[PDB]
Design an enzyme around this catalytic site. Structure first.
Site, PDB file in Angstrom:
ATOM      1  N   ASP A   1     -44.257 -38.274  23.077  1.00 14.59           N
ATOM      2  CA  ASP A   1     -43.950 -37.626  21.773  1.00 14.59           C
ATOM      3  C   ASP A   1     -45.682 -37.173  21.104  1.00 14.59           C
ATOM      4  O   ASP A   1     -45.524 -37.067  19.736  1.00 14.59           O
ATOM      5  CB  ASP A   1     -43.231 -38.457  20.862  1.00 14.59           C
TER       6      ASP A   1
ATOM      7  N   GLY B   1     -44.662 -40.838   4.403  1.00 16.35           N
ATOM      8  CA  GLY B   1     -43.725 -40.163   5.337  1.00 16.35           C
ATOM      9  C   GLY B   1     -42.461 -41.136   5.716  1.00 16.35           C
ATOM     10  O   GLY B   1     -42.394 -42.155   5.315  1.00 16.35           O
TER      11      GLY B   1
ATOM     12  N   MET C   1     -39.589 -45.606   7.289  1.00 20.84           N
ATOM     13  CA  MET C   1     -40.379 -45.072   6.122  1.00 20.84           C
ATOM     14  C   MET C   1     -41.903 -45.557   6.146  1.00 20.84           C
ATOM     15  O   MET C   1     -41.919 -46.793   6.300  1.00 20.84           O
ATOM     16  CB  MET C   1     -39.667 -45.270   4.490  1.00 20.84           C
TER      17      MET C   1
ATOM     18  N   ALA D   1     -36.414 -41.202  11.163  1.00 15.86           N
ATOM     19  CA  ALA D   1     -34.785 -41.329  11.600  1.00 15.86           C
ATOM     20  C   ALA D   1     -34.366 -42.865  11.035  1.00 15.86           C
ATOM     21  O   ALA D   1     -33.142 -42.965  10.536  1.00 15.86           O
ATOM     22  CB  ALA D   1     -34.489 -41.296  13.059  1.00 15.86           C
ATOM     23  N   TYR D   2     -35.248 -43.831  11.431  1.00 15.81           N
ATOM     24  CA  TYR D   2     -35.039 -45.075  10.785  1.00 15.81           C
ATOM     25  C   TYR D   2     -36.028 -46.136  10.147  1.00 15.81           C
ATOM     26  O   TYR D   2     -36.339 -47.002  10.336  1.00 15.81           O
ATOM     27  CB  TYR D   2     -34.306 -45.784  12.170  1.00 15.81           C
TER      28      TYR D   2
END
Ligand SMILES: Nc1ncnc2c1ncn2[C@@H]1O[C@H](COP(=O)(O)OP(=O)(O)CP(=O)(O)O)[C@@H](O)[C@H]1O
Ligand SMILES: [Mg+2]
Ligand SMILES: [Mg+2]
Length: 349
Positions: free
Chosen positions: A140, A23, A29, A26-27
């Protein structure tokens, strides 16, 4: 040269090999990989935060918090790879246990039995108990941040938005706006954007419970203000008492301008759900954050009675305190702190 995954370099060899994409964000992997030293498969999260101050701030928090936590329902850090000099550190690689899937993926391919819903919820709240006892807010929680194995072990991941809020100090007015993912965002994130509390994580858990019961997100808004209309569309308009508790005058006036909406009964939305689950859902998805159930009371709800055991639910040995919240620093300084914090995994240390 070093291995590549979808055009991204993963400078992690020779210890870690056989990289496969899992996956991204934004910044960063995430890949699966094989640990040649320990003969196990691991997850490797590559993080590239150094161009932006907010990304640096969040990376230092995620690393600090995960290194201190040790709990069966929270993902750990096994190892951290980065360059031997700060001038050469462009990336940080966080090595963790490999989990088979996440709850977002599971819900695309499978309707869950009450037994499974119940067991997953127990584990989410057991981990969250630990997180909240450390004076951390996750901020989150959502299905893609809940990792799962075939033995149905569950671990909370992605502490990239997480922070410390020491309850010795009033944080009202100093918290970051626009936290959480839209669908999992409590009403007070919109109506009290700088003065919400850890209660926001209980709301997110409620949204997750709802999503496990129906395989679809309960409040799927398209934008900031539409999210709040979706919430009020199910809960109904807040009572006058709950309006009176909203300190921010322009948020309270904004609600008073909205048209009346009636409460949609939970049993109408979830006609085949277990009755204890809906009672618990109700208490989690309570509009007023002061009346919303807390993590310990949620664990002791009758729905989780077959798993609840406070002798086997650790709390944090050393809660985080105010001193380490002072991280509004230039990105150069944050990089230095990230360099220091990751040194315990270097050969030289
Ligand atoms: N240890 C692990 N084992 C298996 N899969 C993992 C994992 N850690 C992360 N993942 C997978 O990779 C995805 C992205 O990871 P994570 O959420 O940590 O990255 P991220 O923070 O850059 C995305 P965002 O910032 O938008 O939350 C997760 O939703 C999950 O599917
Ligand atoms: Mg994520
Ligand atoms: Mg993230």
């Amino acid at each position: 040269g070093p291995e590549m995954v979808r055009g991204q370099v993963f400078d992690v060899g020779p210890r870690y090999t056989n990289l496969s994409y899992i996956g991204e964000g934004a910044y960063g992997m995430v890949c699966s990989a094989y640990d040649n030293v320990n003969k196990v498969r691991v997850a490797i999260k590559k993080i590239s935060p150094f161009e932006h101050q907010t990304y640096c701030q969040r990376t230092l928090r995620e690393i600090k918090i995960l290194l201190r936590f040790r709990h069966e329902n929270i993902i750990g850090i096994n190892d951290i790879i980065r360059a031997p000099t700060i001038e050469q550190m462009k990336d940080v690689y966080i090595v963790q246990d490999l989990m088979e899937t996440d709850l977002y993926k599971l819900l695309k391919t499978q309707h869950l039995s009450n037994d499974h819903i119940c067991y997953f919820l127990y584990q989410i709240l057991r981990g969250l108990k630990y997180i909240h006892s450390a004076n951390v807010l996750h901020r989150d929680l959502k299905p893609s941040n809940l990792l799962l194995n075939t033995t149905c072990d569950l671990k909370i991941c992605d502490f990239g938005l997480a922070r410390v809020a020491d309850p010795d100090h009033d944080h009202t007015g100093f918290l970051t706006e626009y936290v959480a993912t839209r669908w999992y965002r409590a009403p007070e994130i919109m109506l009290n954007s700088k003065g919400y509390t850890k209660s926001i994580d209980i709301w997110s858990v409620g949204c997750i419970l709802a999503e496990m019961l129906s395989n679809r997100p309960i409040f799927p808004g398209k934008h900031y203000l539409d999210q709040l209309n979706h919430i009020l569309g199910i809960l109904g308009s807040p009572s006058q008492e709950d309006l009176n508790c909203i300190i921010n005058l322009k948020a309270r006036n904004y609600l008073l301008s909205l048209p009346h909406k009636n409460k949609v009964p939970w049993n109408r939305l979830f006609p085949n759900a277990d009755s204890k689950a809906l009672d618990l859902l109700d208490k989690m998805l309570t509009f007023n954050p002061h009346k919303r159930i807390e993590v310990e009371q949620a664990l002791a709800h009758p729905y989780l009675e077959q798993y609840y055991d406070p002798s086997d639910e650790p709390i944090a040995e050393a809660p985080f305190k105010f001193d380490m919240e002072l991280d509004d620093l230039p990105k150069e300084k944050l990089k230095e702190l990230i360099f220091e914090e990751t040194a315990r995994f270097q050969p030289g240390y």
